[PDB]
């Protein structure tokens, strides 16, 4: 899936962008640069989570039987530990 | 481990010529081994040669009817007594032929189906 | 689609007797030998029965009937002797039936000495070429004995199967790779699957395969032969409610198929289709799994009438028809649909790709 590589490279780009700012800078300039970089990374990751909920919907988009859907649940089980991801999937859980 | 490998393989290489793709592939195995992976692949290639040799030993009984011709084919095949994989294909007719010569009783006729150095074998000791 | 073709069942013989094993002849494919156990109710009847049924005619009765003193647990046409039918016994004693001879009693019978088998013999099979071939038999005590079909009084070779130095392997099933006459795989009551060598410096057990948590019921190596060499694979079916696909390379299961709700008693690779196999359950369900079409659900499923426990399954040599043997002793044959049985030409590469996905 193109979405998988897109999510991976998006996360890497976000981490690099935060990594550019001099973290050990402590003055006002460092504080504001840090706040801006963290805000940018937060919005980017929130977008990564939406790109992932797209696959969460493609779960039902593909799986027809209970076993395939459960195996998709088990393969991506760690990804469901995230807070935004867990609430997206509620109808399949019941 | 190296000494055991050389003890087996020098014997095999020296004596198999006694009994062309067969010699090319054993030489190929010796080329590869010159550690666990190389050893396992060497055993795989050699045991594949042994199974092909076992098919030839099956063709032995396939061809002949009387004892004398099977004895001639046994005499042609000396390289394989040392190898304890051919010993199964060799043991199967060994009873058939040792009991035949026992009923007939000839020293040459007994040696040829038990190989050189028959003094070690349990059935030959009697 | 699976369609009922023929029920085979005799009032006198197969009633109150489970089918212990089935087998199809190689040269006369219409024939089908089926062994049976002792009838509990009637002591006067022989314990062991073996009926050779024929699909060509419409006669309900068996083409040949044989019986012997002890319950038959394996039965097999001598693969290079069409006039013969070998079978094991609970008493641990190979019995050979000659169809040309008019005796339903065995013409030859192996000893019950220490050298020969003494425990039940659930696996018997002829292996080799027409120029030379041996009857390999494996008891539930791990003893495997080479036997010549001509003479059965003396064992050609006798050896025991063991792992971890001294621990007996209670062989419950045994299969061979196609074209291989030295390597074989034996399932054990312990739940482990053992790759063993008949002749060699390490003659005996060669490798242990773990993963089945119940006794192994049925092992079968791959039968279909094509462009790509899939000889290493084999399917086990065990009491832990699973079929498991293995390769001789890998020490762990290649995959686990568990869409069941009971034990699985016998599994067999299809003999023409590479990715198709069939497993028979205790709920009376015969399930054809085509791993190329879909992998998490059976490709086809059919239930016998009355829901009897299905002890055995055997494809025909053509692969179009599959016989399943139930506890009642009725041998019901099914016709496998065209879209399932005959493979697409790319089925071999397709199954290679599915293996790559695993």
């Amino acid at each position: 899936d193109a979405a998988d590589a897109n999510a991976i490279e998006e996360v890497n780009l976000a981490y690099e962008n935060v990594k550019e700012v001099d973290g050990l800078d402590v003055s006002k300039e460092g504080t504001e640069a840090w706040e801006a970089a963290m805000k940018r990374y937060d919005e980017r990751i929130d977008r990564v989570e939406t790109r992932i909920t797209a696959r969460l919907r493609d779960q039902l988009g593909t799986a027809k039987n209970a076993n395939e859907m459960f195996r998709i649940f088990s393969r991506f089980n760690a990804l469901f530990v995230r807070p935004h991801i867990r609430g997206a999937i509620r109808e399949y859980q019941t | 481990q190296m000494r055991k490998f050389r003890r087996q393989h020098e014997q095999l290489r020296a004596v198999i010529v006694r009994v062309a793709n067969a010699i090319e592939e054993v030489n190929l195995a010796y080329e590869n081994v010159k550690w666990e992976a190389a050893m396992k692949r060497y055993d795989e290639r050699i045991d594949r040669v042994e199974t092909r040799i076992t098919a030839r030993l099956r063709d032995q009984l396939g061809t002949a009817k009387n004892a004398n011709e099977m004895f001639r084919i046994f005499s042609r095949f000396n390289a394989l007594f040392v190898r304890p994989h051919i010993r199964g294909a060799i043991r199967e007719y060994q009873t058939q032929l040792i009991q035949r010569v026992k009923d007939d009783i000839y020293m040459k006729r007994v040696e040829d189906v038990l190989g050189k150095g028959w003094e070690n074998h349990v059935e030959g000791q009697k | 689609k699976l369609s009922l073709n023929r029920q085979f069942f005799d009032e006198r013989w197969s009633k109150h007797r489970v089918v212990s094993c089935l087998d199809w002849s190689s040269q006369y494919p219409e024939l089908l030998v089926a062994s049976y156990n002792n009838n509990e109710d009637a002591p006067h009847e022989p314990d062991g029965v073996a009926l050779v049924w024929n699909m060509k005619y419409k006669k309900t009765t068996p083409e040949y009937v044989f019986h012997c003193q002890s319950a038959v647990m394996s039965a097999t046409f001598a693969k290079f002797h069409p006039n013969l039918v070998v079978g094991g016994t609970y008493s641990g004693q190979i019995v050979l039936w000659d169809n040309r001879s008019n005796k339903r009693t065995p013409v030859q019978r192996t000893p019950l000495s220490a050298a020969a088998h003494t425990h039940p013999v659930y696996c018997v099979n002829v292996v080799g070429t027409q120029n030379a071939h041996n009857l390999i038999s494996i008891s539930t005590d791990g003893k495997i004995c080479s036997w010549s079909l001509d003479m059965l009084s003396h064992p050609q070779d006798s050896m025991e199967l063991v792992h971890k130095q001294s621990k007996a392997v209670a062989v419950t099933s045994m299969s061979f790779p196609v074209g291989d006459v030295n390597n074989f795989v034996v399932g054990s009551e312990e739940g482990s699957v053992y790759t063993a060598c008949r002749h060699g410096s390490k003659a005996g057990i060669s490798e242990m395969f773990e993963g089945h948590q119940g006794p192994i019921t049925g092992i079968h190596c791959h039968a279909a032969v094509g462009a790509v060499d899939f000889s290493h694979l084999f399917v086990t079916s065990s009491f832990d409610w699973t079929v498991k696909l293995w390769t001789t390379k890998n020490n762990k299961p290649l995959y686990s198929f568990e869409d069941n709700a009971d034990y699985v008693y016998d599994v067999m690779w299809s003999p023409t289709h590479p990715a198709l196999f069939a497993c028979v359950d205790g709920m009376g369900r015969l399930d054809l799994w085509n791993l190329n079409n879909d992998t998490e659900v059976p490709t086809a499923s059919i239930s016998v009438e009355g829901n009897p426990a299905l002890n055995r399954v055997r494809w025909t040599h053509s692969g179009r028809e599959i016989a399943v043997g139930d506890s009642e002793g009725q041998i019901v044959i099914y016709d496998v649909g065209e879209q399932i049985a005959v493979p697409r030409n790319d089925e071999w590469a397709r199954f290679g790709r599915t293996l790559a996905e695993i």
Side-chain angles (χ1 to χ4, degrees):
Chain A
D1 221 317
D4 311 356
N6 189 7
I8 290 155
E9 86 201 345
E10 280 286 314
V11 167
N12 288 324
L13 288 158
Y15 184 65
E16 193 183 7
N17 281 313
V18 156
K19 163 170 178 210
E20 286 293 310
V21 171
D22 189 8
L24 287 177
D25 186 9
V26 309
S27 66
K28 176 51 57 166
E29 178 167 352
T31 302
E32 301 315 344
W34 183 254
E35 290 287 347
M38 301 285 268
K39 204 92 162 163
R40 278 144 43 76
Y41 170 87
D42 290 328
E43 58 177 18
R44 283 180 59 65
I45 293 291
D46 197 25
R47 287 186 289 267
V48 167
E49 302 312 287
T50 73
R51 298 179 183 106
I52 286 293
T53 301
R55 185 32 191 91
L56 296 180
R57 295 280 168 286
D58 183 29
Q59 186 186 105
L60 165 63
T62 49
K64 74 202 72 53
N65 53 317
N67 288 83
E68 181 61 23
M69 167 159 15
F70 148 74
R71 194 158 291 213
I72 293 296
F73 257 84
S74 161
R75 182 178 178 71
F76 292 5
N77 169 38
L79 203 58
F80 278 81
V81 179
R82 299 286 293 153
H84 302 107
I85 296 300
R86 204 211 301 91
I89 299 295
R90 183 59 143 70
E91 85 291 38
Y92 312 139
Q93 265 174 357
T94 59
Chain B
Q1 291 150 41
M2 293 287 166
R3 187 131 83 167
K4 296 215 292 297
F5 187 122
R6 297 236 192 192
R7 194 186 278 91
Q8 259 158 29
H9 179 83
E10 79 198 340
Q11 151 269 305
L12 174 63
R13 216 204 75 75
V15 78
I16 195 175
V17 196
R18 203 183 186 179
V19 62
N21 191 28
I23 318 180
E24 282 221 89
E25 91 209 344
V26 63
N27 295 336
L28 188 134
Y30 191 59
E31 180 268 323
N32 321 333
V33 298
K34 292 320 295 150
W35 171 241
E36 72 296 20
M39 256 285 260
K40 255 185 79 170
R41 207 147 75 179
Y42 163 83
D43 303 298
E44 213 74 356
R45 218 181 298 266
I46 295 297
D47 293 0
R48 210 60 59 94
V49 186
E50 290 165 0
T51 60
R52 190 271 319 173
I53 261 300
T54 295
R56 289 289 293 105
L57 295 153
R58 291 276 173 279
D59 193 61
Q60 183 215 310
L61 177 56
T63 42
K65 282 271 163 143
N66 206 1
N68 196 355
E69 311 215 10
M70 275 175 32
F71 279 34
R72 198 211 289 98
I73 302 288
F74 259 110
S75 37
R76 198 201 165 288
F77 282 65
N78 198 344
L80 328 178
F81 258 118
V82 47
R83 210 80 201 194
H85 166 274
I86 293 102
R87 183 57 52 72
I90 265 184
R91 239 276 288 178
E92 178 189 359
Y93 324 121
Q94 249 179 3
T95 292
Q96 197 198 305
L97 298 172
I98 201 178
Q99 215 279 344
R100 187 156 185 182
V101 66
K102 168 150 57 163
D103 299 353
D104 298 356
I105 289 152
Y106 275 108
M107 192 46 258
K108 174 52 59 171
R109 204 159 276 99
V110 167
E111 181 294 339
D112 227 327
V113 284
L114 301 200
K116 283 194 143 188
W118 66 241
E119 293 274 28
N120 55 13
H121 296 112
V122 301
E123 288 276 26
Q125 274 178 8
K126 169 262 196 191
Chain C
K1 59 192 165 292
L2 297 159
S3 153
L4 202 173
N5 201 267
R6 303 273 301 288
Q7 323 314 64
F8 285 115
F9 173 69
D10 176 281
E11 161 55 353
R12 198 210 271 92
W13 280 127
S14 51
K15 157 147 90 180
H16 307 335
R17 290 188 204 259
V18 326
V19 190
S20 306
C21 164
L22 286 102
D23 180 21
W24 295 87
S25 156
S26 48
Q27 332 155 17
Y28 303 160
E30 52 261 34
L31 309 184
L32 163 65
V33 68
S35 39
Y36 300 88
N37 60 309
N38 64 279
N39 190 347
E40 293 285 359
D41 305 358
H44 281 329
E45 283 289 355
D47 304 345
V49 180
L51 311 175
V52 178
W53 314 80
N54 198 337
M55 275 256 275
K56 203 166 188 175
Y57 303 165
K58 292 210 189 0
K59 324 272 191 303
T60 65
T61 52
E63 184 195 49
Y64 310 110
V65 48
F66 303 103
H67 59 88
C68 94
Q69 95 150 342
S70 183
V72 189
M73 298 289 191
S74 50
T76 184
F77 287 100
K79 193 122 97 197
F80 304 77
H81 281 278
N83 323 63
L84 267 48
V85 171
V86 174
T89 43
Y90 190 115
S91 164
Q93 153 180 0
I94 307 307
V95 313
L96 184 78
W97 292 292
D98 205 335
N99 59 356
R100 298 297 110 164
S101 187
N102 305 331
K103 282 148 55 46
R104 300 183 182 158
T105 309
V107 304
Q108 289 147 37
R109 62 162 31 90
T110 42
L112 289 171
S113 82
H117 287 309
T118 36
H119 277 94
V121 172
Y122 275 92
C123 329
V124 178
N125 191 349
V126 169
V127 185
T129 53
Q130 196 186 354
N131 296 4
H133 48 275
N134 315 329
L135 187 89
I136 309 161
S137 43
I138 318 195
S139 44
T140 65
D141 78 289
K143 197 183 311 168
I144 156 185
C145 291
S146 178
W147 296 97
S148 166
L149 292 166
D150 293 17
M151 95 192 189
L152 283 171
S153 158
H154 168 70
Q156 271 185 151
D157 193 22
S158 180
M159 66 174 186
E160 282 277 356
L161 288 161
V162 283
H163 197 51
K164 298 290 186 185
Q165 286 77 37
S166 306
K167 155 213 181 193
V169 172
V171 173
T172 312
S173 302
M174 168 263 283
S175 66
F176 270 70
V178 65
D180 197 324
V181 311
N182 198 34
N183 305 292
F184 55 95
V185 280
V186 303
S188 88
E189 160 63 35
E190 197 262 343
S192 160
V193 175
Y194 290 98
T195 295
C197 215
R198 205 153 64 79
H199 321 325
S201 50
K202 310 310 299 173
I205 307 200
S206 296
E207 185 179 342
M208 170 135 162
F209 294 65
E210 306 201 288
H212 269 309
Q213 283 303 9
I216 312 295
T217 76
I219 207 163
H220 193 251
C221 316
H222 212 272
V225 188
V228 304
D229 190 7
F230 288 7
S231 302
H232 49 87
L233 293 119
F234 65 89
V235 289
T236 50
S237 49
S238 161
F239 276 1
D240 69 319
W241 300 30
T242 55
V243 195
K244 281 186 194 293
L245 172 57
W246 316 74
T247 66
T248 314
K249 313 296 200 331
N250 215 20
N251 250 327
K252 294 155 142 76
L254 257 288
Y255 204 57
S256 192
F257 326 84
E258 52 280 9
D259 200 16
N260 322 104
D262 213 284
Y263 297 171
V264 189
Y265 290 102
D266 201 357
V267 63
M268 193 182 174
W269 274 115
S270 155
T272 181
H273 190 288
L276 187 65
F277 68 85
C279 66
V280 282
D281 211 61
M283 321 286 317
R285 215 181 22 248
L286 156 60
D287 319 278
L288 259 66
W289 292 71
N290 197 337
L291 311 191
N292 299 345
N293 281 6
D294 39 344
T295 294
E296 265 69 359
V297 84
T299 295
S301 298
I302 188 151
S303 297
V304 191
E305 181 261 348
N307 288 359
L310 259 300
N311 200 31
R312 305 284 293 183
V313 70
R314 292 295 297 191
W315 292 84
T316 49
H317 276 101
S318 67
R320 312 293 280 94
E321 292 141 318
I322 187 167
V324 296
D326 54 41
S327 55
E328 316 298 321
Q330 199 181 39
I331 307 283
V332 303
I333 287 171
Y334 289 105
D335 274 40
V336 185
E338 183 27 32
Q339 77 293 36
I340 294 156
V342 178
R344 319 188 89 78
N345 283 351
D346 55 32
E347 281 289 312
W348 274 264
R350 194 145 297 138
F351 189 43
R353 224 171 290 105
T354 59
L355 255 55
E357 280 182 20
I358 293 150

